[PDB]
Amino acid sequence: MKRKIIAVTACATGVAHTYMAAQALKKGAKKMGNLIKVETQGATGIENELTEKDVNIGEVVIFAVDTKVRNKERFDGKVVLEVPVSAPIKDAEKVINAALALIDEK
After folding, report:
1. Is 76 a catalytic residue?
2. Which residues of 49-64 are buried (b: 16+ CB within 10 A; e: fewer)?
3. Other C-beta atoms within 10 Å of 72: how many?
4. φ and ψ at 45, to 5 degrees?
5. Exactly one of 11, 29, 38, 61 is catalytic; which is it?
6. Domains defined along the chain, listed by start
7. What is the SS3 assignment for 70?
């Protein structure tokens, strides 16, 4: 029922994107009934650092960023879904479906 997904959100100038995306994405994932780990980088400052543990829990890695990711090292090599940071704001549920499309696709 609860699919394991991790997602990184990061933007430098325009953090309103980062936070709003992380909120909407979180709401949608919870509404669908899944387990998501949303990492929030305030450009350089990571406010929710996903460790190897968390990263190995989530299978799909959603990347909604305008800037670079620091923890990306652990996410790299895993199955990811790369989208604009603005995307999970308007189409959060759609982004979640996209993540599912990388592992299952329907």
Report:
1. no
2. ebeeebbeebebbbbb
3. 16
4. -80, 110
5. 11
6. 1-106 (3.40.50.2300)
7. coil
